Structure 1
């Protein structure tokens, strides 16, 4: 089996910005989720080879993970906060699509998503 190329974290002809909201997404949102006890399945792209999940990238066609998000934020890849919020939501949705209610990985995603929502609720005005 083979893994796909990971999502890009740099693209020189994509216009970039730093906004106060994107700074909050790195310094508050990403940092809070990244340090959580349940972060570790989400800190890098799913390695379908090592996990023996040959169907993962047959089912998940828009993969996303916090390692990618972290690099995108550190590289100022985004134009706006909504792009980054969408990446987080894609990561969570992929987990719920591939897995089953009650699976450990789903409980982990749910805990991280609760914290994500608590922090996003306090996103500063631009």
Structure 2
């Protein structure tokens, strides 16, 4: 990994760590819309994204730069803001995890 992608990998590891598990856990795995009863999920959300997919793409060297990584993480949050009422608990959890992400992403070496 490049220096910037090392920083992204560190962010990823942090977002998956026990320190943030109380609000990060809905984002660990792909939304299983059928299991959750969300039968309109894939009509509303065109591009699903989750942290296990980000992790697989990092491991496979899919991301060519930090911007591509950031776009996927932010896409995950945007899907949550699109599908759920703004006052829902899961949106509150998204906001808190995105705060962790954005403040550490801003510390990118450059």
Query: Which runs of no fewer than 5 residues in structure 2 stay unpaired?
Result: none
- The structure with more radius of gyration: 1
Structure-2 residue corresponding to 1:26: 9
**Alpha-carbon deviation of 1:19?**
1.2
Alpha-carbon RMSD:
0.9
Number of equivalences: 107
* In 2: Cα distance, 1:123 partner to 1:70 partner: 18
Instruction: Return structure 1 stretches of 4+ with deviation > 4 angstroms.
Output: none
* In 2: Cα distance, 1:32 partner to 1:100 partner: 27
TM-score (norm 2): 0.93
Query: Which runs of no fewer than 5 residues in structure 1 stay unpaired?
Result: 1-17
TM-score (norm 1): 0.82
Is residue 68 of structure 2 the alignment partner of residue 83 of structure 1? yes
